[PDB]
Design a protein. Structure first.
Lengths: 168, 186, 95, 197
RNA sequence: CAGGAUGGCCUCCCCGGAGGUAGGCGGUGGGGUAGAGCACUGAUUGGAGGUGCAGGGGGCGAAAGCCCCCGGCCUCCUGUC
RNA sequence: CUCAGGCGGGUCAGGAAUCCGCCGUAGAGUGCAAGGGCAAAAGCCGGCCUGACUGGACCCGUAACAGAGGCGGGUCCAGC
RNA sequence: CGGCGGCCAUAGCGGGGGGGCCACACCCGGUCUCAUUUCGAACCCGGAAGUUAAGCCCCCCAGCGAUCCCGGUUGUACUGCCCUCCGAGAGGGGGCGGGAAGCCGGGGACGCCGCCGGCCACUAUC
């Protein structure tokens, strides 16, 4: 695994379809709905994305868990509804490397500089909801703390910030 | 529940109201679906032709299976389409031979009816019978309104909406009047 | 050419809305097109047998005459003067 | 087409269920007028029609409603000798069209001999036109003269039933065919003249 | 293939000869890229309500028995693009 | 003469061929990649029939514009 | 009423009424010309006694669909053009010339038009 240095923005054309990539690895996030139903809470708090990007599968799970861990320990799962709205589709392309020598380059120039699928990534556009949580006013203050913690783990920056929708 | 009684009054009312609007029996097609041929030759065909009094028709095969219809282009089954007095006469002897009082939830959903009893062929001595003895049957009755004939030909084709259309209620009592008994349950 | 012989830059160019699909009114197949008349040539993909190279699409010529059922139209594809034989199906009147 | 924007264009004539486009496209190619012959149970129509992309124009009509009135013919109007003498009336108006070319549009119908469309065609040729056909499809003399029908009509009578002469069914109830008489046809066939007497 | 030839292209000369339309506007034609979306061909994330069914668990057992049930196989107002 | 497929009824072990009705604008099928085209058809069936014909053009692709052989098709007319 | 077209859903679905419908349907005979690898059902020869009830024609109602328009979102999304205009070399923004879909609200729209006949007619009933 490389660092996120091309997995942090939109810069390659949308090429999703598994009938031209012929399958790609599934998401590292294994759960997507958590907590209780959305009608048992009054208010809606979002983490809001302000910048178009592609965010890796690895970053979605880290971000999601780190929020969910704090939420679980303090609040318990008797309360809160937490959803991660987006789904990764965006297919990823890498030239293959094992850093050879002799007859091996890795490389290459050409002799197939072309992609390989290593994962999936989610395209987050302007004004989308990276996270959407439901809570009461009481259980506002845990969600905001989790949300700072997410915002770092985002590949860029937020500038609409921890946002009260308000849902009221 | 019950079914016969409202149906009967509607059809009787409609005839008085316009006596060349009443529903009719378009055909009775007597068929054996499962086949007597595919792997054998149907001598049930000889038995069927005497019983109808009309020529039967062979049935080409399609698909590939292992039971019947194993290759294509081979005869599989036999049917005869009866209309007019030739149907009514069939119905009276054949329905009487098998059972009566079958649910109107086990008949078609459009005023049409299929009977489903198997066994016994009328007309002795033919039902002993070499090579195929008494085989099974299915009898379908297609009921329709009188005005549809207009649609069938090449001139003034029209699919007639509910303003004269065949309603599920009437078709069942019209068939029953001719020869038939349907149970109340349905 | 290496990927041309009658098709290239087509699929979507020969594709239409489902409302413009179905074989078109009979009138246009029957339609006569006079000589001295200026015609737009528009590709109709509903009729295979007698259909322009996509490069030709949207060209405007003058009907130079007729061969058979088709008409022979002189058109200017670029600078070069060319004559194209096509059925009345693939002509529309200018005005 | 059906509901919402889906495959295939609607057409006034698909819904009407008339015409055969395939045949029609073929017919028109010659540039010759269409004699649009259409059949019904008790009417037969021929009209010399040209095509224009804007509406068709009809040069002359003739109906079986124009042969019942003013030519001393009673008959039935669905029968074959009504078609024959309909060919004759559109044979006197085709010499007033000034062109003798008259080709069959049968709409959507099969071609079999002993038909109305042949019967009229048959009357048209004798009326003096010249047309493109190859013969093998014309009725016999017994149909034209009105004699097959005469043998049937004496057999059957209406609102009666018997065993050979008044047996139930159509026989023709008219003032000058009460039992169907080829005498009647021979008078009316003598009336031939282009001044419409 | 570190090479020729033939065009496009450059120049000089000669011939025929009145329009030409790079420019801009309107009229008459062609069109699916930005964008946008659920209406198809389409890949799939997620919980409901159906319990319509192939079946891995239970019950009046006659271990999914007539009848309901639970991984679930696929409808349905919805759910990512 | 109009379809996969679905729905309910019959037949069968469900099912298929096969039957009966209702729904059904094309998802069917067209030998074979892919795409486009098409429902009184190019799809389905029955019958007949062997033009997958001879000759000589025309046009385009080939090779856009713009040179560039061979070759292919479409489109004509003449003859059968 | 009919027949032949054009635009080809602004003439789709649903429901309602009448017929100013011999002639157009249902309907009835099928011997004969003729359709069915089964049936006059289909195709065709023959007739109209009965039914207007379809169909078909005419009128009307928009709830669904499709056509077109107005306003809101929106001159927003997006864009052609230029910059020692800004950023660390990507690039962006402003001016200038243009400006879409999806959706919401509010509407026209359940045809129009051309030719020719015809019970009735000499006209438009339809």
């Amino acid at each position: 695994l490389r660092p996120a240095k091309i997995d942090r923005y939109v810069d390659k054309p949308a090429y999703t379809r598994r009938e031209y990539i012929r399958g790609a690895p599934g998401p590292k996030i294994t759960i997507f709905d958590m907590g209780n139903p959305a009608g048992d809470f009054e208010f809606e708090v979002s983490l809001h994305t302000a910048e178009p990007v592609q965010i890796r599968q690895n970053a979605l799970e880290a971000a999601r868990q780190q929020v969910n861990r704090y939420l679980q320990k303090n609040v318990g799962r008797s309360n809160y509804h937490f959803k991660i709205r987006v789904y990764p589709f965006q297919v990823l392309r890498e030239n293959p490397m094992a850093t050879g020598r002799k007859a091996d380059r890795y490389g290459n120039g050409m002799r197939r500089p072309f992609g390989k699928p290593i994962g999936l990534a989610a395209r987050l556009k302007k004004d989308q909801k990276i996270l959407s949580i439901r809570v009461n006013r009481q259980h506002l203050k845990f969600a905001i703390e989790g949300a700072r913690r997410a915002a770092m783990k985002f590949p860029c920056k937020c500038y609409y910030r921890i946002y009260d929708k308000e849902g009221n | 529940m019950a079914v016969e009684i409202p149906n009967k009054e509607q059809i009787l009312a409609d005839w008085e109201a316009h006596p060349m609007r009443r529903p009719r029996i378009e055909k009775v097609t007597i068929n054996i679906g499962v086949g007597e041929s595919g792997e054998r030759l149907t001598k049930a065909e000889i038995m069927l032709q005497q019983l109808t009094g009309q020529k039967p028709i062979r049935r080409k095969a399609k698909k590939t299976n292992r039971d019947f219809g194993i290759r294509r282009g081979e005869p599989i089954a036999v049917k005869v389409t009866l209309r007019g007095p030739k149907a009514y006469e069939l119905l009276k002897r054949l329905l009487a031979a098998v059972d009566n009082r079958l649910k109107a939830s086990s008949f078609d959903e459009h005023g049409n009816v299929c009977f489903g009893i198997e066994e016994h062929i009328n007309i002795p001595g033919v039902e002993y019978d070499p090579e195929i003895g008494i085989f099974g049957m299915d009898v379908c009755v297609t009921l329709e309104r009188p005005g549809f004939r207009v649609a069938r030909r090449k001139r003034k084709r029209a699919k007639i909406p509910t303003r004269h259309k065949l309603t599920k209620e009437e078709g069942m009592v019209y068939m029953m009047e001719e020869f038939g008994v349907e149970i109340v349950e349905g | 050419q290496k990927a041309h012989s009658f098709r290239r830059k087509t699929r979507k160019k020969l594709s239409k809305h489902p409302r413009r699909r179905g074989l078109p009114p009979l009138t246009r197949f029957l339609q006569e097109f006079e000589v001295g008349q200026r015609v737009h040539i528009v590709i109709e993909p509903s009729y295979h047998k007698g259909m322009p190279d996509p490069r030709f699409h949207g060209r405007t010529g003058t009907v130079v005459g007729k061969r058979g059922e088709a008409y022979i139209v002189e058109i200017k594809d670029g600078s070069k003067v060319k004559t194209l034989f096509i059925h009345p199906v693939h002509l529309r009147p200018q005005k | 087409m059906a509901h919402g924007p889906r495959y295939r264009v609607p057409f006034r004539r698909r819904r009407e269920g008339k015409t055969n486009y395939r045949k029609r496209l073929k017919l028109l190619k010659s540039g010759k007028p269409r004699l649009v012959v259409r059949k019904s149970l008790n009417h037969h129509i021929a009209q010399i029609i040209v095509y224009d992309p804007k509406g068709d124009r009809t040069l002359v009509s003739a109906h079986t409603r124009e042969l019942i009135r003013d030519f001393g013919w009673k008959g039935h109007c669905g029968n074959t000798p009504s078609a024959y003498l309909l060919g004759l009336l559109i044979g006197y108006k085709a010499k007033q069209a000034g062109i003798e070319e008259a080709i069959l549009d049968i709409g959507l119908h099969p071609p079999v001999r002993g038909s109305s469309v042949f019967a009229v065609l048959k009357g048209a040729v004798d009326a003096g036109l010249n047309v493109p056909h190859s013969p093998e499809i014309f009725p016999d003399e017994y149909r034209i003269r009105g004699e097959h029908i005469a043998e049937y009509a004496k057999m059957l009578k209406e609102q009666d039933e018997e065993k050979f002469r008044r047996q139930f069914g159509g026989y023709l109830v008219k003032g000058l065919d009460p039992e169907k008489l080829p005498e009647h046809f021979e008078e009316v066939k003598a009336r031939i003249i282009e001044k419409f007497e």
